[PDB]
DNA sequence: ATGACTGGAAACTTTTTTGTACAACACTCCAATAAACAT
């Protein structure tokens, strides 16, 4: 809807605390890939960025694919938000992970990425792959608070036998010849 | 009789443990920075 409708705004994935699910989100952004072409999708992994600050330009030289620039220090939250907002470029997403752990002493650098899709040219989509540990109560005020930002949030409950026994059917029956184990070990 | 006994006798000292209140503290970060290692 977001892509045919020309719309844009926040998704918040709060899943459950290790389940393995990192997964789940690359077999939509593959399949995207072969239907429709002509987007361009930037990855993010800031495993590397121990500081809550690089953030930012790590992921500024990817503007237009064949088209770059080079930093000069110190312009960050001038040139970013600039090209986003232009319609005649195409749909862009990002993706993030790990938003938890970029938070700080007063988490001014989420103010920023959570208004984009909310002011003029809404042209960017926010999914965040991260595990549940705090809702909105500290790193998200705007939240219970102002009438603008309306976030959706989906969550994952923790899959019981009726999902880790089914897993495990097509798991071992579609590569082996025969099973090495009885039925009554796996319940 | 009032003035003499035992008989009971109300405020009232003590503590006090309760919350708060404000003391540090290791503090992550920073912000050049400065020399060094390229130029």
Known sequence: EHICGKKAGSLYLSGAPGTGKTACLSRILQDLKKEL???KTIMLNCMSLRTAQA???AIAQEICQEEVSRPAGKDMMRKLEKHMTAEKGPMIVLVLDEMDQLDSKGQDVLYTL???PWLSNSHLVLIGIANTL???DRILP?????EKCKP???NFPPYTRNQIVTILQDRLNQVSRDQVLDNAAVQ
């Open 37 to 39: 072409k002509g987007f």
């Open 152 to 154: 959706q949030l989906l």
């Open 55 to 57: 953030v930012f330009p």
């Open 114 to 116: 959570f208004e984009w």
């Open 134 to 136: 705090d809702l909105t």
């Open 142 to 146: 705007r939240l219970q608070a102002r």
